[PDB]
Amino acid sequence: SIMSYNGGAVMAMKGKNCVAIAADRRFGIQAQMVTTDFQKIFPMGDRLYIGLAGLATDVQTVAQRLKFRLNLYELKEGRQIKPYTLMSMVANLLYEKRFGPYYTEPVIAGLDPKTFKPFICSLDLIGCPMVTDDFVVSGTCAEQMYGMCESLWEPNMDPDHLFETISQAMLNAVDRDAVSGMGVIVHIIEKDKITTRTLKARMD
Amino acid sequence: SRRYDSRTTIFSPEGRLYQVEYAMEAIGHAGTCLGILANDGVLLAAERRNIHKLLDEVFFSEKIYKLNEDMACSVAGITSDANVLTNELRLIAQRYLLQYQEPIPCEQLVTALCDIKQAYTQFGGKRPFGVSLLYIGWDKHYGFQLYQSDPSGNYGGWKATCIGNNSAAAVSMLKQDYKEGEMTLKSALALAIKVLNKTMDVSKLSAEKVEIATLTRENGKTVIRVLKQKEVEQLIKKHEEEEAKAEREK
Amino acid sequence: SYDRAITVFSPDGHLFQVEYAQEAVKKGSTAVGVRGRDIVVLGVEKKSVAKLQDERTVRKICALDDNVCMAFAGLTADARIVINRARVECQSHRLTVEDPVTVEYITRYIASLKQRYTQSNGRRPFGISALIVGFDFDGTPRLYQTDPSGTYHAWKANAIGRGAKSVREFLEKNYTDEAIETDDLTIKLVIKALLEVVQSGGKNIELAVMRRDQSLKILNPEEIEKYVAEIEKEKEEN
Amino acid sequence: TGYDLSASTFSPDGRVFQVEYAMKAVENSSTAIGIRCKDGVVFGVEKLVLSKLYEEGSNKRLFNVDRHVGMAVAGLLADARSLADIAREEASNFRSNFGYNIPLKHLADRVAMYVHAYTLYSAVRPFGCSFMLGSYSVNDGAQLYMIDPSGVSYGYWGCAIGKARQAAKTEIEKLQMKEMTCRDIVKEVAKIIYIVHDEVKDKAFELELSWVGELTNGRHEIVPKDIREEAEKYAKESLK
Amino acid sequence: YDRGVNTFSPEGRLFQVEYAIEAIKLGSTAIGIQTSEGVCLAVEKRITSPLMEPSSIEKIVEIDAHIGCAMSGLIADAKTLIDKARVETQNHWFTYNETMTVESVTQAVSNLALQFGEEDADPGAMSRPFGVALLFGGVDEKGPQLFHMDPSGTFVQCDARAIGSASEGAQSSLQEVYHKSMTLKEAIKSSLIILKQVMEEKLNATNIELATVQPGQNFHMFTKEELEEVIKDI
Amino acid sequence: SRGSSAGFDRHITIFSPEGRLYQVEYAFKAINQGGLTSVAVRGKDCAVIVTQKKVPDKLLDSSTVTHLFKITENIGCVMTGMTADSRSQVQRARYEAANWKYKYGYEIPVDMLCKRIADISQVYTQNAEMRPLGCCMILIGIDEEQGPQVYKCDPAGYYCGFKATAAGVKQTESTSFLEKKVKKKFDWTFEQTVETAITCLSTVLSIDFKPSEIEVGVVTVENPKFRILTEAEIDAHLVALAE
Amino acid sequence: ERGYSFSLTTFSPSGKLVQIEYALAAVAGGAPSVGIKAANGVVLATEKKQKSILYDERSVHKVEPITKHIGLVYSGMGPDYRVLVHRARKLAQQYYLVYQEPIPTAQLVQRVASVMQEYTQSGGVRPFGVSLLICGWNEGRPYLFQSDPSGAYFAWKATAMGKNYVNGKTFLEKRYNEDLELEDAIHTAILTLKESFEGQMTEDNIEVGICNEAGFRRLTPTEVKDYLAAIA
Amino acid sequence: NQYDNDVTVWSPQGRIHQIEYAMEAVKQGSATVGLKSKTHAVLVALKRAQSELAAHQKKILHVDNHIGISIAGLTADARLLCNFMRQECLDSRFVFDRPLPVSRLVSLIGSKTQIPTQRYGRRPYGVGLLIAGYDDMGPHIFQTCPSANYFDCRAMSIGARSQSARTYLERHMSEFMECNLNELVKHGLRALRETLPAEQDLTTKNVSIGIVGKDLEFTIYDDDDVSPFLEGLEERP
């Protein structure tokens, strides 16, 4: 219930060669909503976004520490992060607190720096790697989002259809959930651009 | 251990400190580093000594590193001390970024480095880091700003400064040919080429002998660009053309 | 793990390390401080102006609180760390007392830090002499001088660094009660004291003044130029 | 200098002069001799009487480090006391960790390793003491190990440490100590220690003697007094 | 360098402690006299320049309401020991609801004294012996008391002692003019006249610091007016 | 005659002007200080360590001065130099072998044990605050898939696999004998290996040693536990070599 | 164990670390080694000159791997090489544990350089008396790095440490091509080794490791002598 | 030379120069003569003062109700060891509820003083302790030299000019044991008297004693309370 203390919903699927990642925007205590413009998808690279769900404080702290170590590594090494390396590093970060786990289940989405092959993965509060080709979801909306994705997702999607599918997924998974929603932010990472969009969702 | 200690962290009878003096002398015979400021950016000119044909030279820069998102550095002296210093600087800069969610000001990071270097000279019984550091960067409070630090732990803010051989001649050239407040990127680059050609007259200006870096502020974003070999060749050609024109007019 | 006794008693009980720290202080830059009846003024010789240099970073006069400031003479880096530690002590006192800091207490704990470094293992004392200016709760001006040996004493006026003895011997004869009544006379006295040290007189010199809890500010270069002109006017009429 | 200042450095040839000086400091001390026989191990140590105001049995060079192990020492006596304390601590640890009294062989090996441990670092100096340990067991019999200040432990049918050690060794060679009787060997030890003692060099002197063996039920003990006067009388007669 | 901090002399004494005593004779001159009506402490300020404030030049410090101390030598090093003595006295008061005896304070100060080294204890410890001679004047259940604390740790209870630049000679003259049945007024007069005679410079109220401890009154330090009142007769 | 020293270059193990470590190279002659020669050989299926037993005095129990130490059941060792250093290295080798046995579930290979001992010796050489253990250890064992093995560490730490080597005062003469023997004969059986091992000491040192004047340990592939030869086997090998 | 807290390595009046110069002299006095780069891999070669044949030259190895894609050779003191390679192995394993990806050769060389610098600036220890020639393959690229006892590092297309090292460097420069193959790299390495072997090289006396996209692998004496026969 | 600047060095003659300096310092200390009888043990020490004005600082420390010590040498080290011994005595009384025997106390302090003889940069405690105590085995007198070596003794004299006192003790050791408490303390006082030259006097105002007996707890007597003991004393020999 600690991961549902603030609520959350994050997803990421794959297109033909592009990636769509989306998250809810509601932030607040278990009862009341404080802010409807909260950011939950953060850039770990030019072609790599990460979504975090769970306890908001743990979300922010994990994001800050991950950005810390990621920037340190990329300055020491001189190349943009590889998505597999970022996923392994964040999984190790979560595992370092095995007895003090961050109540967060993150997802990592983006493209290969050179191949542009779509990559998506998920973790848990301990940091279990979970690489699934079709889609990964996390948060309090887990069941609704899994049910949506396992029917709305198809392989080899164009960016526009990919955006439509993920937008419908978020809209129809948060409208049936009480501790999430109130606006959805969607990022579409294509080969040569990224599109950030806010869905016209029900604010309550 | 009394007889066999090196006691490098004590005073001297005349009040100086031999270890930092020797470090400064070693830096003096070490490679050449130059830092300058322009109205739209700051430029770095670093000279690489080991230029054997066996080098893979795959690295973007040898003595020039990137401390953080909006600040670059140039090292002078021992390159391993340079590497450990640079990654410590990156670590603490990212620490400030984590703690405050704001890019670390250049003065902050230079002050922290000078603190740790002075402490390392103060005690510990170890030989001090014999590397001079020349930092450039952009910040919210002062924008383009560059500092020169010393192994003794002292730092200073300069519009333009150089370290290495013929440091006095280089700073004299800057004082003679730097237009304060009216130095554009092109004229600053030309002055940097002049210094690189003059402060190291032996083994006259060569493309692979030096590396050139620039730091600018475009669209509220700090861009650090390392000039390629073709760029350095263009600088050499421009310097030769301007020197020939000046001599012909003379 | 580094615990070699650096500061030890030489023959006749002379702390040669303390003498070497004093030598480093003397070889350092020139700084003076006067404690006027209403204000406190610090003057530091900005020797080797070395144009194209941002003098803000090398300013040897740093304020500790809204009512406390110091100017050093000696090692710049040891000065910087001691200034950081003095900022720490002032803030800790303000937290634990929720009252304005006391200049004498600040100087005393800096002296205690210096004496701990003299008495510690594997450490050498801070080769800096510090002139600490400030004002108490009642607005009483305070001027204290501490040395690397750890001894701190309150002075009406004194000097540290290069030519410190000559400047203080000049001041002890040029210091009168009526000569520090107003800010103009105090500034002129400090400028004429530093004139014998600085060759430029107006451009290789920096002045800082603190009033009775009135947000101390550094004297403007134009003010320095016009006050050097004023002291030259006094010289030509005298 | 440089080759004799600390135990952490070799000579240009590869010698340890600090250990050699420790050997000198243990040689110039008073003599201490230990003889093992088929049914006991005896120790006779020579005590220098600085003044007659001292007690008999003062500043003993004989220590009882285990329930069945003695310790005859020579050299720096405070160092000997510290080494005896370490030996009894090791015996206590072995008894706690294994439930039975430590054998003399392993005790001597561990103590020699400990001694050699403080002959490697400049932060310490080699022990200025050599010591002989004797013990008895039902399955092992009488055992006697001599340990150098360097840290070398060997079994000895009979050993002597001190100034007149070599003379004590040489004259006692006529004794076939490996199958002798402890009671008469006590008298022979009194004899040898009297002859090897230099009355001119040390006018005032005293003897501390003890044995451990089967006659002691396998527990270290001092000589009973009556046997002490009897051995003293035999030694006086042997002085001739 | 070469010689350590725990090295003796061929005759069997620490030459570092001898150097500390030499520094003691380099310190400021201080005089302390104990009588049946209290104890008095005096010291010469050694004013370098008139610009130096006499207020900050005070060699006499209050350990407790009934104890005063006079320091000579490394005055910077003496304040740490003074703070330790005061905190230990207050700890004793906190533990036993009584004022700590002067003798116990002196013994504790000796315990803190001569505790230093390179690698002998926790690294955050002393490296050199204290180079300050102390005169602990106080009043307790045993009446007025005066203790000479030598930097060697050889604490001494003495009726009257003069230390500093002019320790010897002046102490003998003080003893010659000292008796076993002198009043507090006689004690302060004698100490003042001896200090004035041994002054290296013309002394006044701005050249000496005077303080006293009485059986009835607490530790009181003589202000300028009373200093002039007592010095005008001398 | 002006016995000058170049500061601390010749006093503690620091880099000398000639690119050498003086206290490391003093350990080579510190091996010679023991006055004892230890030579070891391996056959096609056996490894034999033959070492002369010094008896400076009968008054010590010569049955308890045996210098052959069993690190494990199947590993035996002999050392040269300071005897206390030898005992310390034997104890350390036993500790490391037992630790490997517990942490890895099988008996330590002889090469890895020698490598660990050499690393510890290098730890002494690297540090400038400890005596660099001027003692040399030679160990034997039987290894599956590789056969009998003999390994030798050193205070310097540079070890190597070898058919046969020696450590002691006359290690160079034993080296020369091993050269001539390997250039003369190659095929070795157990009895030939032990005869050559005895012949090495006999030819190099030329003592005509008594049976009680040596201590010999062997490892064979019939009972790989390290076993020490007693007087009977020593006399048998002596008379076999004599005839 | 106390541990000296004063750095044995100190700055000379000229600022030169003369102790590091003596370490480099010890490296030069050690067994020579060479390294060379090809357009699609790296080849490391070195000689193991032991005493008379009583030593089992097969038992000991000089070329050592760190990972499946990184190997290295040294010139200098074997005792220092063992601990240094063991620490490098630990660093590579730790990096693989943290990031679940193979160590890049540049990062591993940076870590080794940091370790060497820590040794040089710390107290109570001696500078390493070896020079490492490190070969590595990552991201479909070859890498060869020179690392000195001073703690610095460089990316060198060809290198030669040990005795006659300057002459070896010049010979490599004369016989180095920008776009050579692995076969040409092996030919050049063996030619340089035999030009500076001083004593009629043998397949046992030469041990060579090759690093390419397939990984790092040490050449056994069979193909070793095969290449020596093909090169003559 | 270099054999006298450290404690961990070995002299070629087989000695430690720091230990020699400590054993010279203990002799350079003030005079102290201790002795015992069959039932009682008494320490007699003359308290030196830096000047006539000083009050002759006490040299006899009260370590336990049944055990007492007298110091000769470094006062701070003596005080530290006295605190350490009294801590041991209180620990024994707290644990086993028995007075800690004198012999074991002296062995423990010897073991404690052995460690500085080996530790690097650690100086020996340059003070000698004359320990007078009573336990179940009668009175005991011990002398712990700064050399970390203790000596059990019937009567020992320490400090400068102690040869005359040592000769007196050797002469009258045959009769120390059987004399009563007053004769014993008189013999000790006469030994201390013979320690000093003829011109100086054994004044009551600079001599102190510490005595422990079969029924008497260890008590220290000063100038006023040593006057009855200073009755009928013969003039200086």
From Swiss-Prot, chain A:
Pfam families: Proteasome. InterPro entries: Ntn_hydrolases_N (IPR029055), Proteasome_beta_3 (IPR033811), Proteasome_bsu_CS (IPR016050), Proteasome_sua/b (IPR001353), Proteasome_suB-type (IPR023333). GO terms for cellular component: cytoplasm; cytosol; extracellular exosome; nucleoplasm; nucleus; proteasome complex; proteasome core complex; proteasome core complex, beta-subunit complex. The modification N6-acetyllysine is found at residue 76. The keyword Endoplasmic reticulum does not apply. The modification N-acetylserine is found at residue 1. GO terms for biological process: proteasome-mediated ubiquitin-dependent protein catabolic process. Induction: Up-regulated in asthenozoospermic sperm. Keywords: Acetylation, Cytoplasm, Host-virus interaction, Nucleus, Proteasome. The keyword Cytoplasm applies. It comes from the Eukaryota. The 26S proteasome consists of a 20S proteasome core and two 19S regulatory subunits. The 20S proteasome core is a barrel-shaped complex made of 28 subunits that are arranged in four stacked rings. The two outer rings are each formed by seven alpha subunits, and the two inner rings are formed by seven beta subunits. The proteolytic activity is exerted by three beta-subunits PSMB5, PSMB6 and PSMB7. Belongs to the peptidase T1B family. This is Proteasome subunit beta type-3. It comes from Homo sapiens (Human). The gene is PSMB3.
UniProtKB/Swiss-Prot annotation, chain C:
CDD domains: proteasome_alpha_type_7. GO terms for cellular component: cytoplasm; cytosol; extracellular exosome; nucleoplasm; nucleus; proteasome complex; proteasome core complex; proteasome core complex, alpha-subunit complex. The keyword rRNA-binding does not apply. Phosphorylation by ABL1 or ABL2 leads to an inhibition of proteasomal activity and cell cycle transition blocks. Changing residue 111 to D: Found in patient with severe intellectual disability; uncertain significance. It comes from the Eukaryota. The modification N6-acetyllysine is found at residue 226. This is Proteasome subunit alpha type-7. It comes from Homo sapiens (Human). The 26S proteasome consists of a 20S proteasome core and two 19S regulatory subunits. The 20S proteasome core is a barrel-shaped complex made of 28 subunits that are arranged in four stacked rings. The two outer rings are each formed by seven alpha subunits, and the two inner rings are formed by seven beta subunits. The proteolytic activity is exerted by three beta-subunits PSMB5, PSMB6 and PSMB7. PSMA7 interacts directly with the PSMG1-PSMG2 heterodimer which promotes 20S proteasome assembly. Interacts with HIF1A. Interacts with RAB7A. Interacts with PRKN. Interacts with ABL1 and ABL2. (Microbial infection) Interacts with HIV-1 TAT protein. Glycans are attached at residue 129. It is found in: Cytoplasm; Nucleus. GO terms for biological process: proteasome-mediated ubiquitin-dependent protein catabolic process. Belongs to the peptidase T1A family. The modification Phosphotyrosine is found at residue 152. GO terms for molecular function: identical protein binding. Its main location: cytoplasm.
Swiss-Prot record, chain D:
Keywords: Acetylation, Cytoplasm, Host-virus interaction, Nucleus, Phosphoprotein, Proteasome. Induction: Down-regulated by antioxidants BO-653 and probucol. Up-regulated by bacterial lipopolysaccharides (LPS) and TNF. GO terms for cellular component: cytoplasm; cytosol; extracellular exosome; nucleoplasm; nucleus; proteasome complex; proteasome core complex; proteasome core complex, alpha-subunit complex. The 26S proteasome consists of a 20S proteasome core and two 19S regulatory subunits. The 20S proteasome core is a barrel-shaped complex made of 28 subunits that are arranged in four stacked rings. The two outer rings are each formed by seven alpha subunits, and the two inner rings are formed by seven beta subunits. The proteolytic activity is exerted by three beta-subunits PSMB5, PSMB6 and PSMB7. Interacts with AURKB. Interacts with CDKN1A. Interacts with MDM2 and RB1. Interacts with the C-terminus of TBXA2R isoform 2. Interacts with DNAJB2. (Microbial infection) Interacts with HIV-1 Tat protein. It is found in: Cytoplasm; Nucleus. GO terms for biological process: proteasome-mediated ubiquitin-dependent protein catabolic process. GO terms for molecular function: ubiquitin protein ligase binding. PROSITE patterns: PROTEASOME_ALPHA_1 (PS00388), PROTEASOME_ALPHA_2 (PS51475). SUPFAM superfamilies: N-terminal nucleophile aminohydrolases (Ntn hydrolases). This is Proteasome subunit alpha type-3. Belongs to the peptidase T1A family.
UniProtKB/Swiss-Prot annotation, chain E:
One of its GO terms (cellular component) is nucleus. CDD domains: proteasome_alpha_type_5. It comes from the Eukaryota. Expressed in fetal brain (at protein level). Induction: Up-regulated in colon cancer cell lines. Up-regulated in fetal Down syndrome (DS) brain (at protein level). May be the target of the transcriptional activator NFE2L2. The 26S proteasome consists of a 20S proteasome core and two 19S regulatory subunits. The 20S proteasome core is a barrel-shaped complex made of 28 subunits that are arranged in four stacked rings. The two outer rings are each formed by seven alpha subunits, and the two inner rings are formed by seven beta subunits. The proteolytic activity is exerted by three beta-subunits PSMB5, PSMB6 and PSMB7. PSMA5 interacts directly with the PSMG1-PSMG2 heterodimer which promotes 20S proteasome assembly. Component of the 20S core proteasome complex involved in the proteolytic degradation of most intracellular proteins. This complex plays numerous essential roles within the cell by associating with different regulatory particles. Associated with two 19S regulatory particles, forms the 26S proteasome and thus participates in the ATP-dependent degradation of ubiquitinated proteins. Belongs to the peptidase T1A family. This is Proteasome subunit alpha type-5.
